[PDB]
Amino acid sequence: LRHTFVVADATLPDCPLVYASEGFYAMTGYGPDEVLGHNCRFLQGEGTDPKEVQKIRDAIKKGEACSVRLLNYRKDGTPFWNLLTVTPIKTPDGRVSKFVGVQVDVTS
Numbered sequence: 544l545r546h547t548f549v550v551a552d553a554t555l556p557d558c559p560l561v562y563a564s565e566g567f568y569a570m571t572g573y574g575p576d577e578v579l580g581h582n583c584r585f586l587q588g589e590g591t592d593p594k595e596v597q598k599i600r601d602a603i604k605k606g607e608a609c610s611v612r613l614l615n616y617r618k619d620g621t622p623f624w625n626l627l628t629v630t631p632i633k634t635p636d637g638r639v640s641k642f643v644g645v646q647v648d649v650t651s
Protein backbone atom coordinates (compact mmCIF):
# COMPACT_ATOMS: atom_id res chain seq x y z
CA LEU A 544 0.00 0.00 0.00
CA ARG A 545 1.39 3.37 -1.09
CA HIS A 546 1.68 5.47 2.05
CA THR A 547 3.65 8.39 3.46
CA PHE A 548 5.00 9.02 6.95
CA VAL A 549 5.64 12.19 8.98
CA VAL A 550 6.67 13.09 12.53
CA ALA A 551 5.26 16.05 14.47
CA ASP A 552 6.93 17.46 17.58
CA ALA A 553 4.46 17.56 20.47
CA THR A 554 6.92 19.27 22.83
CA LEU A 555 6.18 22.44 20.80
CA PRO A 556 2.68 23.77 21.40
CA ASP A 557 1.39 23.56 17.80
CA CYS A 558 2.89 20.24 16.64
CA PRO A 559 5.25 21.29 13.82
CA LEU A 560 6.45 18.64 11.41
CA VAL A 561 10.06 17.63 11.99
CA TYR A 562 10.53 14.69 9.58
CA ALA A 563 8.73 13.70 6.37
CA SER A 564 9.26 10.76 4.05
CA GLU A 565 10.31 11.10 0.40
CA GLY A 566 6.77 10.16 -0.62
CA PHE A 567 5.13 12.90 1.44
CA TYR A 568 6.98 15.55 -0.54
CA ALA A 569 6.35 13.74 -3.83
CA MET A 570 2.64 13.27 -3.09
CA THR A 571 1.97 16.83 -1.87
CA GLY A 572 4.39 18.70 -4.13
CA TYR A 573 5.98 20.64 -1.25
CA GLY A 574 9.70 20.62 -0.57
CA PRO A 575 11.20 20.24 2.89
CA ASP A 576 11.86 24.01 2.90
CA GLU A 577 8.08 24.58 3.06
CA VAL A 578 7.09 21.63 5.27
CA LEU A 579 9.48 21.27 8.21
CA GLY A 580 8.69 23.46 11.20
CA HIS A 581 5.09 23.98 10.06
CA ASN A 582 1.82 22.40 11.09
CA CYS A 583 0.34 19.83 8.73
CA ARG A 584 -2.76 22.02 8.25
CA PHE A 585 -1.26 23.79 5.21
CA LEU A 586 -2.51 20.77 3.24
CA GLN A 587 -6.15 21.76 3.91
CA GLY A 588 -8.46 23.93 1.82
CA GLU A 589 -12.07 24.57 0.82
CA GLY A 590 -13.69 21.13 0.77
CA THR A 591 -12.00 19.90 3.95
CA ASP A 592 -14.70 18.75 6.40
CA PRO A 593 -14.34 20.93 9.52
CA LYS A 594 -15.95 18.22 11.65
CA GLU A 595 -13.31 15.77 10.46
CA VAL A 596 -10.56 18.32 11.14
CA GLN A 597 -12.00 18.71 14.65
CA LYS A 598 -11.54 15.00 15.44
CA ILE A 599 -7.79 15.30 14.81
CA ARG A 600 -7.60 18.52 16.84
CA ASP A 601 -9.41 16.89 19.76
CA ALA A 602 -7.37 13.67 19.75
CA ILE A 603 -4.06 15.56 19.73
CA LYS A 604 -5.13 17.65 22.74
CA LYS A 605 -6.44 14.56 24.51
CA GLY A 606 -3.32 12.62 23.50
CA GLU A 607 -5.14 9.79 21.70
CA ALA A 608 -4.76 8.22 18.27
CA CYS A 609 -7.17 9.08 15.52
CA SER A 610 -8.08 8.17 11.95
CA VAL A 611 -9.96 10.51 9.61
CA ARG A 612 -10.65 11.05 5.92
CA LEU A 613 -9.62 14.54 4.78
CA LEU A 614 -9.63 16.38 1.48
CA ASN A 615 -6.14 17.79 0.95
CA TYR A 616 -4.56 19.93 -1.75
CA ARG A 617 -1.22 19.63 -3.47
CA LYS A 618 0.99 22.68 -3.88
CA ASP A 619 -0.42 23.03 -7.42
CA GLY A 620 -3.92 23.42 -5.96
CA THR A 621 -5.31 20.07 -7.13
CA PRO A 622 -7.15 17.99 -4.51
CA PHE A 623 -6.64 14.49 -3.20
CA TRP A 624 -8.23 12.37 -0.48
CA ASN A 625 -5.87 11.67 2.42
CA LEU A 626 -6.68 8.83 4.82
CA LEU A 627 -4.75 10.08 7.84
CA THR A 628 -3.88 8.09 10.98
CA VAL A 629 -2.15 10.01 13.79
CA THR A 630 -0.53 8.08 16.65
CA PRO A 631 0.73 9.52 19.96
CA ILE A 632 4.21 8.59 21.17
CA LYS A 633 4.66 8.84 24.93
CA THR A 634 7.75 9.03 27.13
CA PRO A 635 7.95 6.66 30.14
CA ASP A 636 6.34 9.42 32.25
CA GLY A 637 3.13 9.10 30.22
CA ARG A 638 3.77 12.46 28.53
CA VAL A 639 3.36 12.91 24.77
CA SER A 640 6.58 13.74 22.93
CA LYS A 641 5.88 13.19 19.22
CA PHE A 642 2.88 12.47 17.00
CA VAL A 643 3.39 10.15 14.03
CA GLY A 644 1.20 10.14 10.95
CA VAL A 645 0.60 7.72 8.11
CA GLN A 646 -1.02 9.38 5.09
CA VAL A 647 -2.55 7.30 2.28
CA ASP A 648 -3.87 8.82 -0.95
CA VAL A 649 -7.27 7.17 -1.32
CA THR A 650 -8.46 8.94 -4.50
CA SER A 651 -8.30 5.38 -5.96
Ligand SMILES: *[C@@]12=NC3=[C]C([C])=C([C])[C]=C3N([C][C]([O])[C]([O])[C]([O])[C]OP([O])([O])=O)C1=NC(=O)[N]C2=O
Nearest residue numbers: 551582583584586587596599600629642643644646
Ligand atom coordinates in the same frame (compact mmCIF):
# COMPACT_ATOMS: atom_id res chain seq x y z
C1 LIG B 1 -1.59 15.90 8.10
N1 LIG B 1 -0.87 14.94 8.77
C2 LIG B 1 -0.65 15.07 10.13
C3 LIG B 1 0.33 14.31 10.75
C4 LIG B 1 0.53 14.42 12.13
C5 LIG B 1 1.59 13.60 12.81
C6 LIG B 1 -0.25 15.28 12.89
C7 LIG B 1 -0.03 15.38 14.37
C8 LIG B 1 -1.24 16.04 12.26
C9 LIG B 1 -1.43 15.94 10.88
N2 LIG B 1 -2.38 16.69 10.24
C10 LIG B 1 -3.29 17.63 10.98
C11 LIG B 1 -2.87 19.03 11.34
O1 LIG B 1 -1.55 19.05 11.80
C12 LIG B 1 -3.83 19.52 12.44
O2 LIG B 1 -3.72 18.70 13.58
C13 LIG B 1 -5.29 19.53 11.96
O3 LIG B 1 -5.47 20.52 10.98
C14 LIG B 1 -6.27 19.79 13.10
O4 LIG B 1 -5.84 20.83 13.94
P1 LIG B 1 -6.41 22.33 13.79
O5 LIG B 1 -6.05 23.16 15.00
O6 LIG B 1 -5.81 22.93 12.53
O7 LIG B 1 -7.91 22.30 13.65
C15 LIG B 1 -2.57 16.52 8.88
N3 LIG B 1 -3.52 17.31 8.29
C16 LIG B 1 -3.72 17.23 6.93
O8 LIG B 1 -4.61 17.90 6.40
N4 LIG B 1 -2.94 16.35 6.19
C17 LIG B 1 -2.00 15.57 6.84
O9 LIG B 1 -1.28 14.84 6.16
